[PDB]
């Protein structure tokens, strides 16, 4: 009941507030920022596979794309050999 984690994102100024929406139907989502950015949080850890960084590495010559928009997730990364996994960390 305290490991949390958070992720944000900046888009342009309509799609934000849309996610907006979404992050509120549910009755647990929690908020942080909302003029510049929107960032989020949650409560507990976060795990991902290799899988997901071979994805990014097809899609790592997006980076110009993701300088206009910002972009964040749970708060730290550790990574051991090839999986990626990341808590709440802070």
């Given at each position: ?9 900046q ?9 907006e ?15 510049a ?27 110009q ?16 050999d ?5 808590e709440?960390k802070?």
């Amino acid at each position: 009941m305290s490991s949390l984690v958070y992720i944000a994102f900046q888009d342009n100024d309509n799609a934000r507030y849309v996610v907006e929406a979404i992050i509120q139907d549910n009755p647990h989502a929690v908020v942080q920022h909302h003029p510049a950015m929107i960032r989020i949080e949650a409560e507990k850890r976060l795990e991902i596979r290799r899988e997901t960084v071979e994805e990014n590495l097809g899609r790592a010559w997006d980076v110009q794309e993701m300088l206009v928009d910002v972009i964040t997730i749970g708060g730290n990364v550790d990574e051991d050999d090839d999986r990626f996994v990341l808590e709440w960390k802070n």
